[PDB]
Design a protein around this ligand. Structure first.
Ligand code: HEM
Ligand code: HEM
Ligand code: HEM
Ligand SMILES: [Fe+2]
Ligand SMILES: [Fe+2]
Ligand SMILES: [Fe+2]
Ligand SMILES: [Fe+2]
Ligand SMILES: [Fe+2]
Ligand SMILES: [Fe+2]
Ligand SMILES: [Fe+2]
Ligand SMILES: [Fe+2]
Ligand SMILES: [Fe+2]
Ligand SMILES: [Fe+2]
Ligand SMILES: [Fe+2]
Ligand SMILES: [Fe+2]
Ligand SMILES: [Fe+2]
Ligand SMILES: [Fe+2]
Ligand SMILES: [Fe+2]
Ligand SMILES: [Fe+2]
Ligand SMILES: [Fe+2]
Ligand SMILES: [Fe+2]
Ligand SMILES: [Fe+2]
Ligand SMILES: [Fe+2]
Ligand SMILES: [Fe+2]
Ligand SMILES: [Fe+2]
Ligand SMILES: [Fe+2]
Ligand SMILES: [Fe+2]
Ligand SMILES: [Fe+2]
Ligand SMILES: [Fe+2]
Ligand SMILES: [Fe+2]
Ligand SMILES: [Fe+2]
Ligand SMILES: [Fe+2]
Ligand SMILES: [Fe+2]
Ligand SMILES: [Fe+2]
Ligand SMILES: [Fe+2]
Ligand SMILES: [Fe+2]
Ligand SMILES: [Fe+2]
Ligand SMILES: [Fe+2]
Ligand SMILES: [Fe+2]
Ligand SMILES: [Fe+2]
Ligand SMILES: [Fe+2]
Ligand SMILES: [Fe+2]
Ligand SMILES: [Fe+2]
Ligand SMILES: [Fe+2]
Ligand SMILES: [Fe+2]
Ligand SMILES: [Fe+2]
Ligand SMILES: [Fe+2]
Ligand SMILES: [Fe+2]
Ligand SMILES: [Fe+2]
Ligand SMILES: [Fe+2]
Ligand SMILES: [Fe+2]
Ligand SMILES: [Fe+2]
Ligand SMILES: [Fe+2]
Ligand SMILES: [Fe+2]
Ligand SMILES: [Fe+2]
Ligand SMILES: [Fe+2]
Ligand SMILES: [Fe+2]
Ligand SMILES: [Fe+2]
Ligand SMILES: [Fe+2]
Ligand SMILES: [Fe+2]
Ligand SMILES: [Fe+2]
Ligand SMILES: [Fe+2]
Ligand SMILES: [Fe+2]
Ligand SMILES: [Fe+2]
Ligand SMILES: [Fe+2]
Ligand SMILES: [Fe+2]
Ligand SMILES: [Fe+2]
Ligand SMILES: [K+]
Lengths: 156, 156, 156, 156, 156, 156, 156
């Protein structure tokens, strides 16, 4: 089925965001694991897997619409040097991603691509859960202190 | 994540409706049970539990959006004195609730809060099922007669 | 069997205290969950459920005695802004509520409503366990430190 | 142990009431069964078994207190001729029984026989459940009509 | 079905004997239990249950024959003060009961109420088993001595 | 938040009685076991465990009320030299315990400490069971003779 | 056939030490439980049970040797006011106990009561495990800090 070219362009923009998030989260996960903060590593890995699944659904939708998925362009990773920086960088990336998702949903509604809208809404629900996770961890660092927070995320 | 203040105000309005419905339905349930109309009591209890779960989701969403859930303000319960009045009072309350849900959905769409919209749509689907249940019971009272209808709802 | 009018007034007063506690504890529970303090959130949810069950038993007893349960009047919630304030606010509520239970039991005894007395005694046993829980947590904060206490109530 | 002679007199009065209820409810049960109203018959049999178990506990307590259980004196049975009369006669009997139970509890409290008081309170809780059952059935006859009420209690 | 009025009178006489035996044996059972003679108490309870089941069948038959079961008139209980007296009092009661059963069977045969006769014969077989039990226990007291007999019926 | 000072004194008095009974019954148990009267020894051990559990509940209650449990003061043990004396000494001790329990319950009721009252009533129910056990054993010695009574309590 | 009088005196001295430890550790256990330090409370309860089992074995041995177990004389409990004092007071008590055990073993060896010696050696092995437990906890307080130590012993 021949999709709207601007919808396909929006879907490729979302896909591009997923690709940044996959790599940033995977590396953050393996950094936490390397440091012996295995619970943080495992949860960051789970976030990376979520983004892999979002990318998959986007690729499948673009192909159905007769578009060309762009897996070539990888935007800027902002890798942190410590736990607080890593969490904040992830959170900043998620906030950029939801902004793009909302603009893509607007466009899908405008051209009556309600199935793409619903896919993007499902991804946006997941991203807001990611934002909730990351905001909550930064808040816990303040409430229990950094050393305790890290201690609680050492052992799986 | 910092939510739109008018969306949060709409969510608290919906929450307020849930709180009325929880108490009205719980008391109606226990009145039917007290009268020995246990099947009616059990179904009304189920409705009250549905509204408890709606309230829960609304509270969680308001907190995520950095709003303050209002569990203090309880609107007017209209407790019936017999089965027909109790069902009709519930139905009137549901019809008020769906009106508020539609206005809240309009606002979420306007400001691109698509995750809150989808939550409210899910609640609205449940409320229309509640309306269907209550309308159907009032119709059955007409078709089988009040005495038979009550008889059929005595024993679980 | 018509119950004593002042006994029914007392039961409605106890019921009113339960309705305050249901909402305050439910909101405190969801606040703790929102902050990622899930062990605190779960325990507070089970306190809320306990009060819901108290309210149910009182409603059933009032109806049996041919009184009108009052679910319309909701007294003042006191929502804390951090863990210490939330625990202290719950403790304030419980201490005020047990004072009313004792006065209600006195009245039941005076008019020989021994079944209502035993119901209120069972609720009072639960409220003193709730007081014990709350006082103990506040004491643990003093013994292990606030940051450690919150750490220990982060993960379920 | 040597019980208070007036307490033993109260316990024998309660036992006397149980013996009336056992026989009245057993006969009402078998009359309902005879008429093909088997659900009514089964519930009335259950009430009769409850009173047998009350009598057993009272006999045991009287003997422990070195009293003589009185199973010789059987008071007045009032056997109804139709369902409404039978239920109302049972209800009248239960209301007489609770009046005697409250006077007995007063006396146990006066002489500090707290264990006998707790037994009598357990019996009283059961009789108030019996009263609730009987009142509820009389109310259902009004709400669903006598013919429907009987129909619903034909088949087990 | 319309029973013979003299047969119904006989059945009510048998029922009257059952009602005496129920109460006498239940009290003897609880006296033996009170004394710590639990095997004697359990067997006497079993005898009491047998008489309850006899009474039930007689009530059912009387009602089928369109008679009025008489549970109002309770004849003389003869409660013993020690084991030998209790057993002998039960035995005396059983011998009175079989005398009445034989006269009732004669009358059933005379008027061709063969189904009532067979019920009464089944009851009589049970009473002769009861007589055998009681006679045997009195004989064992002579053969093993009273102290040994009681010792053997202390523990269940 | 403290209990009533005189209630705490009563609870410590009850606790003192438990501590006497624990030690007296444990030694009596082990004397019976040493003599080869293992069924008596096992039952007496069970009585001692009951008193340990009573003491535990009292200690927990005193601490909740912010009293100081007194485990220092051990009153007079009266150890018997043979089975009859041991049983009688236990019985005398239980009768002193129930006297103190009734005085403590009066006080709890007076100051509206209804949870302490219910705890003491539960302990009192258990002590009256203990009295029943002891009185019954002494009575069995009379009915079956001492040698037979001891014989029946040799083997478990 | 009697044990040595001075061996029996030593065994009663060891028994006296057990009785102190039972009560001291049981109260310390219930204080820790009351404070919400349930893992400390559970371990201390376990220590108290060990001492109850030691006392049982000593009572059995004394009775076999035809001595009189002394459960009347309770020496001085030293109840701590906080975790460090409670642990230290337990440790001081264990060190007194092992001193008396070694003197008792010397005496058993001197008079060739090798079975009493082996029993006391088994108790001594257990007391040195108790000492190891207590010393290790005090050392952990130093290594992890008091607040962390207490935190780690809050939850079971
Ligand atoms: C009149 C006030 C209320 C009464 C008497 C009441 C009663 C109950 C009862 C009896 C249950 C079942 C508990 C059990 O058996 O475990 C229940 C479930 C529940 N209630 Fe309430 N309730 C009240 C109000 C509320 C409110 C105001 C909220 C939240 C804002 C709430 C949240 C819940 C939740 C989340 C459940 C669990 C439902 C499930 O099974 O998923 N309730 N309620
Ligand atoms: C002093 C009066 C009586 C006492 C204390 C007494 C006591 C009892 C008790 C304790 C049970 C066992 C109930 C249970 O544990 O579920 C029982 C069973 C029963 N009783 Fe009675 N009873 C009395 C008189 C009667 C009478 C007068 C009747 C009928 C006319 C009757 C009919 C029955 C029947 C049919 C059962 C069930 C037996 C079975 O099949 O297991 N009882 N009774
Ligand atoms: C302050 C006084 C005491 C208290 C509060 C106390 C408490 C307890 C409790 C709660 C139990 C567990 C019972 C159960 O749950 O079944 C127990 C077990 C036991 N107690 Fe005590 N106790 C006390 C004194 C004693 C004394 C003085 C002795 C012996 C001289 C003793 C001997 C025993 C024995 C043999 C057990 C069973 C241990 C096992 O499980 O193998 N107790 N105690
Ligand atoms: Fe590694
Ligand atoms: Fe997830
Ligand atoms: Fe994503
Ligand atoms: Fe295709
Ligand atoms: Fe666009
Ligand atoms: Fe979808
Ligand atoms: Fe994401
Ligand atoms: Fe590790
Ligand atoms: Fe592990
Ligand atoms: Fe009811
Ligand atoms: Fe549903
Ligand atoms: Fe709802
Ligand atoms: Fe948040
Ligand atoms: Fe709006
Ligand atoms: Fe959704
Ligand atoms: Fe609804
Ligand atoms: Fe029914
Ligand atoms: Fe059913
Ligand atoms: Fe969350
Ligand atoms: Fe609980
Ligand atoms: Fe409550
Ligand atoms: Fe009612
Ligand atoms: Fe009052
Ligand atoms: Fe109760
Ligand atoms: Fe509470
Ligand atoms: Fe404090
Ligand atoms: Fe975590
Ligand atoms: Fe987990
Ligand atoms: Fe029939
Ligand atoms: Fe029942
Ligand atoms: Fe009864
Ligand atoms: Fe007795
Ligand atoms: Fe009286
Ligand atoms: Fe009780
Ligand atoms: Fe009753
Ligand atoms: Fe049928
Ligand atoms: Fe059936
Ligand atoms: Fe007994
Ligand atoms: Fe049999
Ligand atoms: Fe019979
Ligand atoms: Fe018939
Ligand atoms: Fe005849
Ligand atoms: Fe037959
Ligand atoms: Fe018989
Ligand atoms: Fe025994
Ligand atoms: Fe047995
Ligand atoms: Fe032995
Ligand atoms: Fe027991
Ligand atoms: Fe006790
Ligand atoms: Fe406390
Ligand atoms: Fe006092
Ligand atoms: Fe209780
Ligand atoms: Fe006791
Ligand atoms: Fe043997
Ligand atoms: Fe054996
Ligand atoms: Fe506690
Ligand atoms: Fe151990
Ligand atoms: Fe020891
Ligand atoms: Fe010996
Ligand atoms: Fe020595
Ligand atoms: Fe050994
Ligand atoms: Fe030790
Ligand atoms: Fe905790
Ligand atoms: Fe746990
Ligand atoms: K820590």
């Amino acid at each position: 089925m021949k999709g709207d070219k601007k919808v396909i362009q929006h879907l490729n923009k979302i896909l591009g965001n997923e690709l940044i998030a996959i790599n940033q989260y995977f590396l953050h996960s393996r950094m936490w694991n390397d440091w012996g903060l295995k619970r943080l590593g495992a949860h960051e890995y789970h976030e990376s897997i979520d983004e892999m699944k979002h990318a998959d659904k986007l690729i499948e939708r673009i192909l159905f619409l007769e578009g060309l998925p762009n897996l070539q362009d990888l935007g800027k990773l902002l890798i942190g040097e410590n736990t607080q920086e890593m969490l904040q960088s992830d959170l900043n990336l998620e906030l950029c991603a939801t902004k793009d998702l909302r603009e893509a949903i607007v466009h899908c509604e405008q051209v009556h691509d309600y199935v793409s809208r619903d896919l993007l809404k499902d991804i946006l629900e997941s991203e807001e859960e990611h934002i909730d996770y990351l905001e909550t961890q930064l808040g816990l660092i303040q409430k229990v202190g950094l050393e305790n927070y890290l201690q609680s995320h050492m052992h799986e």
